[PDB]
PDB file of C-alpha atoms and ligand atoms in Angstrom:
ATOM      1  CA  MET A   1      -0.020   0.203  -0.078  1.00  0.00           C
ATOM      2  CA  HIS A   2       1.050   3.462  -0.521  1.00  0.00           C
ATOM      3  CA  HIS A   3       0.013   7.355   0.243  1.00  0.00           C
ATOM      4  CA  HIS A   4      -0.365   9.611  -2.821  1.00  0.00           C
ATOM      5  CA  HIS A   5      -0.284  13.161  -3.917  1.00  0.00           C
ATOM      6  CA  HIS A   6      -2.621  13.405  -7.149  1.00  0.00           C
ATOM      7  CA  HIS A   7      -1.046  10.814  -9.173  1.00  0.00           C
ATOM      8  CA  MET A   8       2.528  10.506  -7.537  1.00  0.00           C
ATOM      9  CA  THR A   9       3.497   8.084  -4.652  1.00  0.00           C
ATOM     10  CA  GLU A  10       3.879  10.233  -1.444  1.00  0.00           C
ATOM     11  CA  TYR A  11       6.479   8.606   1.025  1.00  0.00           C
ATOM     12  CA  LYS A  12       5.931   9.408   4.864  1.00  0.00           C
ATOM     13  CA  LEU A  13       9.466   9.946   6.110  1.00  0.00           C
ATOM     14  CA  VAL A  14      10.086  10.431   9.903  1.00  0.00           C
ATOM     15  CA  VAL A  15      13.242  11.998  11.241  1.00  0.00           C
ATOM     16  CA  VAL A  16      13.864  10.760  15.019  1.00  0.00           C
ATOM     17  CA  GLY A  17      16.532  11.340  17.445  1.00  0.00           C
ATOM     18  CA  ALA A  18      17.669  13.358  20.385  1.00  0.00           C
ATOM     19  CA  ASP A  19      17.024  16.992  20.391  1.00  0.00           C
ATOM     20  CA  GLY A  20      20.307  18.749  19.489  1.00  0.00           C
ATOM     21  CA  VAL A  21      21.572  16.070  17.015  1.00  0.00           C
ATOM     22  CA  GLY A  22      20.664  18.171  13.790  1.00  0.00           C
ATOM     23  CA  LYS A  23      17.216  16.585  12.942  1.00  0.00           C
ATOM     24  CA  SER A  24      15.774  19.999  11.710  1.00  0.00           C
ATOM     25  CA  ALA A  25      19.014  21.126  10.286  1.00  0.00           C
ATOM     26  CA  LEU A  26      19.058  17.920   8.036  1.00  0.00           C
ATOM     27  CA  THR A  27      15.422  18.196   7.187  1.00  0.00           C
ATOM     28  CA  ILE A  28      16.119  21.902   6.112  1.00  0.00           C
ATOM     29  CA  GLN A  29      19.066  20.938   4.034  1.00  0.00           C
ATOM     30  CA  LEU A  30      17.095  18.357   2.050  1.00  0.00           C
ATOM     31  CA  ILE A  31      14.038  20.658   1.564  1.00  0.00           C
ATOM     32  CA  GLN A  32      16.462  23.401   0.531  1.00  0.00           C
ATOM     33  CA  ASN A  33      13.868  26.115   0.972  1.00  0.00           C
ATOM     34  CA  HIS A  34      15.269  29.197  -0.349  1.00  0.00           C
ATOM     35  CA  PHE A  35      12.408  31.634  -0.152  1.00  0.00           C
ATOM     36  CA  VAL A  36      12.000  31.838   3.558  1.00  0.00           C
ATOM     37  CA  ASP A  37      14.093  34.071   6.002  1.00  0.00           C
ATOM     38  CA  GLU A  38      15.887  31.641   8.255  1.00  0.00           C
ATOM     39  CA  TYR A  39      13.842  30.652  11.358  1.00  0.00           C
ATOM     40  CA  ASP A  40      14.848  27.782  13.819  1.00  0.00           C
ATOM     41  CA  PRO A  41      11.622  25.234  13.601  1.00  0.00           C
ATOM     42  CA  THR A  42      11.906  24.378  17.041  1.00  0.00           C
ATOM     43  CA  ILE A  43       8.418  22.784  16.849  1.00  0.00           C
ATOM     44  CA  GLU A  44       7.660  19.496  15.359  1.00  0.00           C
ATOM     45  CA  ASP A  45       6.214  20.023  11.873  1.00  0.00           C
ATOM     46  CA  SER A  46       6.306  18.245   8.752  1.00  0.00           C
ATOM     47  CA  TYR A  47       7.595  19.417   5.100  1.00  0.00           C
ATOM     48  CA  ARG A  48       7.047  18.364   1.663  1.00  0.00           C
ATOM     49  CA  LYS A  49       9.552  17.849  -1.378  1.00  0.00           C
ATOM     50  CA  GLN A  50       8.826  16.693  -4.556  1.00  0.00           C
ATOM     51  CA  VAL A  51      11.901  14.344  -5.871  1.00  0.00           C
ATOM     52  CA  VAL A  52      12.760  12.103  -8.820  1.00  0.00           C
ATOM     53  CA  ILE A  53      14.393   9.177  -7.434  1.00  0.00           C
ATOM     54  CA  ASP A  54      15.648   6.781  -9.955  1.00  0.00           C
ATOM     55  CA  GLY A  55      13.457   8.130 -12.903  1.00  0.00           C
ATOM     56  CA  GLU A  56      10.218   8.195 -10.606  1.00  0.00           C
ATOM     57  CA  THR A  57       8.924  11.181  -9.311  1.00  0.00           C
ATOM     58  CA  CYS A  58       7.571  11.212  -6.084  1.00  0.00           C
ATOM     59  CA  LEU A  59       6.566  13.504  -2.984  1.00  0.00           C
ATOM     60  CA  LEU A  60       8.546  13.206   0.320  1.00  0.00           C
ATOM     61  CA  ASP A  61       6.319  14.241   3.172  1.00  0.00           C
ATOM     62  CA  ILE A  62       9.070  14.597   5.992  1.00  0.00           C
ATOM     63  CA  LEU A  63       8.078  14.754   9.546  1.00  0.00           C
ATOM     64  CA  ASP A  64      10.714  16.530  11.748  1.00  0.00           C
ATOM     65  CA  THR A  65      10.175  15.384  15.284  1.00  0.00           C
ATOM     66  CA  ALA A  66      11.073  17.114  18.599  1.00  0.00           C
ATOM     67  CA  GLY A  67      10.805  14.080  20.296  1.00  0.00           C
ATOM     68  CA  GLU A  68       9.078  16.590  23.802  1.00  0.00           C
ATOM     69  CA  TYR A  69       5.383  15.199  24.379  1.00  0.00           C
ATOM     70  CA  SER A  70       3.566  14.998  21.025  1.00  0.00           C
ATOM     71  CA  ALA A  71      -0.034  13.609  21.256  1.00  0.00           C
ATOM     72  CA  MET A  72       0.663  12.426  17.620  1.00  0.00           C
ATOM     73  CA  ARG A  73       3.704  10.220  18.356  1.00  0.00           C
ATOM     74  CA  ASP A  74       2.417   6.813  18.152  1.00  0.00           C
ATOM     75  CA  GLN A  75       0.174   7.951  15.265  1.00  0.00           C
ATOM     76  CA  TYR A  76       3.235   9.678  13.249  1.00  0.00           C
ATOM     77  CA  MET A  77       5.089   6.203  13.929  1.00  0.00           C
ATOM     78  CA  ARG A  78       2.127   4.112  12.460  1.00  0.00           C
ATOM     79  CA  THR A  79       1.703   6.584   9.425  1.00  0.00           C
ATOM     80  CA  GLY A  80       5.580   6.632   8.957  1.00  0.00           C
ATOM     81  CA  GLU A  81       6.853   4.293   6.158  1.00  0.00           C
ATOM     82  CA  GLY A  82      10.703   4.891   6.967  1.00  0.00           C
ATOM     83  CA  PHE A  83      12.620   6.442   9.681  1.00  0.00           C
ATOM     84  CA  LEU A  84      15.920   8.317   9.779  1.00  0.00           C
ATOM     85  CA  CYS A  85      17.467   7.661  13.273  1.00  0.00           C
ATOM     86  CA  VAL A  86      19.775  10.489  14.022  1.00  0.00           C
ATOM     87  CA  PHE A  87      22.800  10.785  16.496  1.00  0.00           C
ATOM     88  CA  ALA A  88      25.406  13.284  16.420  1.00  0.00           C
ATOM     89  CA  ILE A  89      28.798  11.781  16.120  1.00  0.00           C
ATOM     90  CA  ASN A  90      30.109  13.999  19.218  1.00  0.00           C
ATOM     91  CA  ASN A  91      27.305  13.315  21.559  1.00  0.00           C
ATOM     92  CA  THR A  92      27.480   9.496  22.788  1.00  0.00           C
ATOM     93  CA  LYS A  93      24.193   9.782  24.765  1.00  0.00           C
ATOM     94  CA  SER A  94      22.314  10.402  21.550  1.00  0.00           C
ATOM     95  CA  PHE A  95      24.009   7.464  19.860  1.00  0.00           C
ATOM     96  CA  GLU A  96      22.907   5.237  23.042  1.00  0.00           C
ATOM     97  CA  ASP A  97      19.324   6.688  22.723  1.00  0.00           C
ATOM     98  CA  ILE A  98      18.844   5.145  19.111  1.00  0.00           C
ATOM     99  CA  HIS A  99      18.117   1.996  20.399  1.00  0.00           C
ATOM    100  CA  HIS A 100      14.855   3.284  22.259  1.00  0.00           C
ATOM    101  CA  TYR A 101      13.775   5.303  19.324  1.00  0.00           C
ATOM    102  CA  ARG A 102      13.976   1.900  17.465  1.00  0.00           C
ATOM    103  CA  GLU A 103      12.199   0.376  20.326  1.00  0.00           C
ATOM    104  CA  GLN A 104       9.306   2.696  19.988  1.00  0.00           C
ATOM    105  CA  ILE A 105       9.135   2.396  16.132  1.00  0.00           C
ATOM    106  CA  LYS A 106       9.078  -1.662  16.548  1.00  0.00           C
ATOM    107  CA  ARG A 107       6.289  -1.244  19.303  1.00  0.00           C
ATOM    108  CA  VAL A 108       4.009   0.890  17.061  1.00  0.00           C
ATOM    109  CA  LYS A 109       4.557  -0.766  13.622  1.00  0.00           C
ATOM    110  CA  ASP A 110       4.756  -4.403  15.075  1.00  0.00           C
ATOM    111  CA  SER A 111       7.834  -5.124  12.807  1.00  0.00           C
ATOM    112  CA  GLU A 112      11.508  -5.704  12.887  1.00  0.00           C
ATOM    113  CA  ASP A 113      11.833  -4.778   9.191  1.00  0.00           C
ATOM    114  CA  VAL A 114      10.677  -1.015   9.292  1.00  0.00           C
ATOM    115  CA  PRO A 115      12.765   0.806   6.532  1.00  0.00           C
ATOM    116  CA  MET A 116      15.196   2.787   8.570  1.00  0.00           C
ATOM    117  CA  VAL A 117      18.743   4.416   8.123  1.00  0.00           C
ATOM    118  CA  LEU A 118      20.949   5.097  11.091  1.00  0.00           C
ATOM    119  CA  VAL A 119      22.438   8.500  10.574  1.00  0.00           C
ATOM    120  CA  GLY A 120      25.642   9.677  12.251  1.00  0.00           C
ATOM    121  CA  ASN A 121      25.281  13.664  11.844  1.00  0.00           C
ATOM    122  CA  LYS A 122      27.765  16.445  12.328  1.00  0.00           C
ATOM    123  CA  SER A 123      30.456  14.629  10.447  1.00  0.00           C
ATOM    124  CA  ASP A 124      32.099  18.018   9.382  1.00  0.00           C
ATOM    125  CA  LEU A 125      33.304  18.523  13.189  1.00  0.00           C
ATOM    126  CA  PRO A 126      37.140  17.764  13.358  1.00  0.00           C
ATOM    127  CA  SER A 127      36.601  15.699  16.345  1.00  0.00           C
ATOM    128  CA  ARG A 128      34.067  13.070  17.408  1.00  0.00           C
ATOM    129  CA  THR A 129      33.028  10.773  20.492  1.00  0.00           C
ATOM    130  CA  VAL A 130      31.195   8.051  18.507  1.00  0.00           C
ATOM    131  CA  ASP A 131      33.537   5.868  16.358  1.00  0.00           C
ATOM    132  CA  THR A 132      32.500   5.012  12.728  1.00  0.00           C
ATOM    133  CA  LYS A 133      32.776   1.249  13.776  1.00  0.00           C
ATOM    134  CA  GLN A 134      30.570   1.861  16.662  1.00  0.00           C
ATOM    135  CA  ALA A 135      27.767   3.034  14.482  1.00  0.00           C
ATOM    136  CA  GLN A 136      28.277   0.585  11.585  1.00  0.00           C
ATOM    137  CA  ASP A 137      28.186  -2.098  14.196  1.00  0.00           C
ATOM    138  CA  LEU A 138      24.781  -0.898  15.632  1.00  0.00           C
ATOM    139  CA  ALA A 139      23.439  -0.476  12.245  1.00  0.00           C
ATOM    140  CA  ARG A 140      24.427  -4.159  11.364  1.00  0.00           C
ATOM    141  CA  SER A 141      23.035  -5.346  14.546  1.00  0.00           C
ATOM    142  CA  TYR A 142      19.520  -3.984  13.102  1.00  0.00           C
ATOM    143  CA  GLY A 143      20.014  -4.706   9.402  1.00  0.00           C
ATOM    144  CA  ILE A 144      19.928  -1.193   8.233  1.00  0.00           C
ATOM    145  CA  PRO A 145      22.291   1.172   6.534  1.00  0.00           C
ATOM    146  CA  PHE A 146      24.477   3.707   8.384  1.00  0.00           C
ATOM    147  CA  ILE A 147      25.156   6.717   6.712  1.00  0.00           C
ATOM    148  CA  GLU A 148      27.434   9.711   7.985  1.00  0.00           C
ATOM    149  CA  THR A 149      26.195  13.413   7.261  1.00  0.00           C
ATOM    150  CA  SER A 150      26.503  16.873   7.947  1.00  0.00           C
ATOM    151  CA  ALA A 151      23.934  19.474   7.625  1.00  0.00           C
ATOM    152  CA  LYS A 152      26.557  22.024   7.525  1.00  0.00           C
ATOM    153  CA  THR A 153      28.789  20.625   4.593  1.00  0.00           C
ATOM    154  CA  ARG A 154      25.516  18.699   3.207  1.00  0.00           C
ATOM    155  CA  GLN A 155      27.724  15.379   2.827  1.00  0.00           C
ATOM    156  CA  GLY A 156      25.623  12.369   2.998  1.00  0.00           C
ATOM    157  CA  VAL A 157      22.324  14.292   3.314  1.00  0.00           C
ATOM    158  CA  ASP A 158      20.832  13.069  -0.009  1.00  0.00           C
ATOM    159  CA  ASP A 159      22.273   9.700   0.422  1.00  0.00           C
ATOM    160  CA  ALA A 160      20.568   9.447   3.660  1.00  0.00           C
ATOM    161  CA  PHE A 161      17.099  10.535   2.735  1.00  0.00           C
ATOM    162  CA  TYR A 162      17.121   8.842  -0.663  1.00  0.00           C
ATOM    163  CA  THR A 163      18.740   5.690   0.852  1.00  0.00           C
ATOM    164  CA  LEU A 164      15.476   5.555   3.153  1.00  0.00           C
ATOM    165  CA  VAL A 165      13.264   6.139   0.207  1.00  0.00           C
ATOM    166  CA  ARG A 166      14.937   3.159  -1.812  1.00  0.00           C
ATOM    167  CA  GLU A 167      14.474   1.186   1.392  1.00  0.00           C
ATOM    168  CA  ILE A 168      10.887   1.814   1.517  1.00  0.00           C
ATOM    169  CA  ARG A 169      10.362   0.923  -2.289  1.00  0.00           C
ATOM    170  CA  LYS A 170      12.321  -2.254  -1.765  1.00  0.00           C
ATOM    171  CA  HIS A 171      10.498  -3.353   1.376  1.00  0.00           C
ATOM    172  CA  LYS A 172       6.998  -2.408  -0.440  1.00  0.00           C
ATOM    173  CA  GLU A 173       7.818  -4.661  -3.518  1.00  0.00           C
ATOM    174  CA  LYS A 174       9.381  -7.750  -1.549  1.00  0.00           C
TER     175      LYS A 174
HETATM  176  N1  LIG B 201      28.824  21.042  13.139  1.00  0.00           N
HETATM  177  C1  LIG B 201      27.387  20.731  12.995  1.00  0.00           C
HETATM  178  N2  LIG B 201      26.259  21.205  13.597  1.00  0.00           N
HETATM  179  C2  LIG B 201      24.994  20.988  13.408  1.00  0.00           C
HETATM  180  C3  LIG B 201      24.939  20.062  12.027  1.00  0.00           C
HETATM  181  N3  LIG B 201      23.530  19.838  12.177  1.00  0.00           N
HETATM  182  C4  LIG B 201      22.983  20.571  13.249  1.00  0.00           C
HETATM  183  N4  LIG B 201      23.940  21.297  13.825  1.00  0.00           N
HETATM  184  C5  LIG B 201      23.830  22.230  15.034  1.00  0.00           C
HETATM  185  O1  LIG B 201      23.252  21.492  16.232  1.00  0.00           O
HETATM  186  C6  LIG B 201      22.451  22.523  16.837  1.00  0.00           C
HETATM  187  C7  LIG B 201      20.979  21.740  16.833  1.00  0.00           C
HETATM  188  O2  LIG B 201      20.432  21.571  15.544  1.00  0.00           O
HETATM  189  P1  LIG B 201      18.983  21.159  15.360  1.00  0.00           P
HETATM  190  O3  LIG B 201      18.732  20.828  13.724  1.00  0.00           O
HETATM  191  O4  LIG B 201      18.030  22.252  16.067  1.00  0.00           O
HETATM  192  O5  LIG B 201      18.970  19.636  15.942  1.00  0.00           O
HETATM  193  P2  LIG B 201      17.303  19.019  16.364  1.00  0.00           P
HETATM  194  O6  LIG B 201      17.303  19.439  17.614  1.00  0.00           O
HETATM  195  O7  LIG B 201      17.989  17.413  16.400  1.00  0.00           O
HETATM  196  O8  LIG B 201      16.380  19.484  15.482  1.00  0.00           O
HETATM  197  C8  LIG B 201      22.234  23.625  15.979  1.00  0.00           C
HETATM  198  O9  LIG B 201      22.709  24.723  16.615  1.00  0.00           O
HETATM  199  C9  LIG B 201      22.748  23.347  14.691  1.00  0.00           C
HETATM  200  O10 LIG B 201      23.473  24.414  13.978  1.00  0.00           O
HETATM  201  C10 LIG B 201      25.997  19.357  11.526  1.00  0.00           C
HETATM  202  O11 LIG B 201      25.911  18.610  10.593  1.00  0.00           O
HETATM  203  N5  LIG B 201      27.402  19.874  12.077  1.00  0.00           N
HETATM  204 CL1  LIG B 202       6.684  -1.551   7.978  1.00  0.00          CL
HETATM  205 CL1  LIG B 203      22.159  12.048  -5.171  1.00  0.00          CL
HETATM  206 MG1  LIG B 204      14.600  20.228  15.661  1.00  0.00          MG
END
């Protein structure tokens, strides 16, 4: 099954992770909305972008979570078709938090096969506290990709979101 916008598939992507890791910055860097004067979003919200992925136009509807209380939290997880689980490579606790985000997603979606990408953000920093091997090991334990990103340099941001969409497509057609 799929969501739609007119005659194109709409993919419901959810960006989760501890506050401060760069969820909003990554989402902004993918939207690349250029009209707006910069505002720090600072409230949970969703954002749309039309993209052509492997020849196929689609709509991305991206929920940039704050976590805080959201009454919609379980419903967003049920709606969401794939999840970016974001930590910051200089924030060990944010990395250790990932397990709990995955536990919540599995609780709601009743699946261990939910399309997800582990995202290690802030890769532009000249020093780090979570090693690449730690992160690839965790991703391997989940059977999901690990991608290093920076919302500052924009390295890996496209790979992260488009890999997630491709994971959804693969999961949908299995
Ligand atoms: N150095 C660096 N800083 C980042 C990156 N992404 C976000 N930040 C910074 O980390 C802070 C938190 O970013 P924000 O997008 O609000 O994180 P969120 O709370 O996860 O949405 C801000 O001061 C950003 O400038 C990144 O890739 N590299
Ligand atoms: Cl699923
Ligand atoms: Cl690309
Ligand atoms: Mg945010």
